[PDB]
Amino acid sequence: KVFERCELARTLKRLGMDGYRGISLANWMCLAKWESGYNTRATNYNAGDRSTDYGIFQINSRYWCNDGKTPGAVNACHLSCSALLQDNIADAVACAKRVVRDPQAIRAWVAWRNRCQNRDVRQYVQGCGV
């Protein structure tokens, strides 16, 4: 599913993401926007290390979910990577929360550092009623 901007903002809010571990909803929107264009079925293979990024937040198979084909990978969110390709983002949100409970928090995603950090992200939630 490809979410429309405000549709996703309210969906994330309902899921408890607004201010989760100090991360504003606007930051999560900026992350999903740059990672997948709000697309839950997006996938990106990384030929260099044999891992794959899954779903709306492009969560990597090396450390977060199990796809059974990534060498010596672990599964910190304890989910099948398939769970990250659902139209319903509840599991992807639970996993994204798991990711930010680590030392780097939101900085775990390089795309967030490149396109969201120290930037005006207000735009992402404007007019969405969140």
Swiss-Prot record:
Q: What class of enzyme is it?
A: hydrolase
- Note the PROSITE patterns from the entry: GLYCOSYL_HYDROL_F22_1, GLYCOSYL_HYDROL_F22_2
- Reaction catalysed by this chain? Hydrolysis of (1->4)-beta-linkages between N-acetylmuramic acid and N-acetyl-D-glucosamine residues in a peptidoglycan and between N-acetyl-D-glucosamine residues in chitodextrins
Active-site residues?
E35, D53
**Main location as per UniProt:** secreted
Every C-type lysozyme domain range: 1-130
Organism superkingdom:
Eukaryota
The free-text function statement in the UniProt record for this protein reads: Lysozymes have primarily a bacteriolytic function; those in tissues and body fluids are associated with the monocyte-macrophage system and enhance the activity of immunoagents.
What is this protein's name? Lysozyme C
Could you say which EC number(s) this protein's record lists? 3.2.1.17
Q: Which disease is it linked to?
A: Amyloidosis, hereditary systemic 5: A form of hereditary systemic amyloidosis, a disorder characterized by amyloid deposition in multiple tissues resulting in a wide clinical spectrum. AMYLD5 primarily affects the viscera, and the predominant clinical features are renal dysfunction of varying severity, and intra-abdominal bleeding. Inheritance is autosomal dominant.
Q: How does this polypeptide assemble, per the annotation?
A: Monomer.
Cellular location of this protein?
A: Secreted
Q: Which GO terms describe its cellular component?
A: azurophil granule lumen; extracellular exosome; extracellular region; extracellular space; specific granule lumen; tertiary granule lumen
Q: Does the keyword Protein biosynthesis apply?
A: no
Q: Keyword annotations for this protein?
A: Amyloid, Amyloidosis, Antimicrobial, Bacteriolytic enzyme, Disease variant, Disulfide bond, Glycosidase, Hydrolase, Secreted, Signal
Q: Name one GO biological process term.
A: killing of cells of another organism
GO MF annotation, one: identical protein binding
Q: What else is known?
A: Lysozyme C is capable of both hydrolysis and transglycosylation; it also shows a slight esterase activity. It acts rapidly on both peptide-substituted and unsubstituted peptidoglycan, and slowly on chitin oligosaccharides.
Cystine links in this protein are C6-C128, C30-C116, C65-C81, C77-C95
Q: Which gene encodes it?
A: LYZ
One matching Pfam family is: Lys
Q: Family per UniProt?
A: Belongs to the glycosyl hydrolase 22 family.
